[PDB]
Design a protein around this ligand. Sequence first.
Ligand SMILES: O=C(c1ccc2c(c1)OCO2)N1CCCCCC1
Length: 282
Amino acid sequence: MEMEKEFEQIDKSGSWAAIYQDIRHEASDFPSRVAKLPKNKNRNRYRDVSPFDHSRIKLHQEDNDYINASLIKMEEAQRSYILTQGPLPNTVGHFWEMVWEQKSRGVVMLNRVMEKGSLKCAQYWPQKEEKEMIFEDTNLKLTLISEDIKSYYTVRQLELENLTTQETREILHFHYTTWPDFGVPESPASFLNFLFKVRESGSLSPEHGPVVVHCSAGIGRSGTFCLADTCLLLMDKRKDPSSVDIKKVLLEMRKFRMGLIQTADQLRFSYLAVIEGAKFIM
Ligand SMILES: O=C(c1ccc2c(c1)OCO2)N1CCCCCC1
């Protein structure tokens, strides 16, 4: 079926939970043996969210190459994304090592450091120009260059220096600050405006490594971001945009990382974002 009318048909019939459970039943199951090794327990935020072995990002390190991060490679859309968890106190150095080694231009953050009164990720970037951060375990230095605070999101320019070689790079930090503590946003308008800002920066483009995107677990909000981007791109590329099937795209992405889209409300919100976004493109 088309998307917008499949949408109204699920709303009128109140069957979002049944649609979402079908997706969960059909999703791929692949091994995640490296994630579950005992030496990696303090590298995982949640015991039930793990990268698959076949698509995990490897750190260029001979001691321990593990990070909770996955490469989502979308062949028809010609986009790639790295989806990862919010860094932990003992993985902030690994996170920036991955950014460096994969040649990413942008980092997309979809959570606040504290939500619901608890810490959802480490404070992994500097908050003041004159107070830079040094990660001694991976030999990197990170400096805040500038910061632009808007009503729904903040963009920061950061300098990352590899202290071994003295090479430096400019990394853009796109921080969506207004996703609610419970549920999903009422309108997709600000989320779409945020997506378009990330796109306009060059951070999603083939001349760079894959964008790094995260929330707390790296599957819910993060899944919504890459699912919406990929579906809108396919609607531009194809002769028949109504052929884009959002459930099929989601199942394809779930071949690369488990659990993408965590609730039936997130699934509905993803539909809403693609539907509204397709009207603005034209
Ligand atoms: O700092 C970088 C840069 C960033 C990330 C990279 C990279 C280069 O190579 C590998 O990953 N640029 C490149 C162009 C955009 C702005 C100017 C400077």
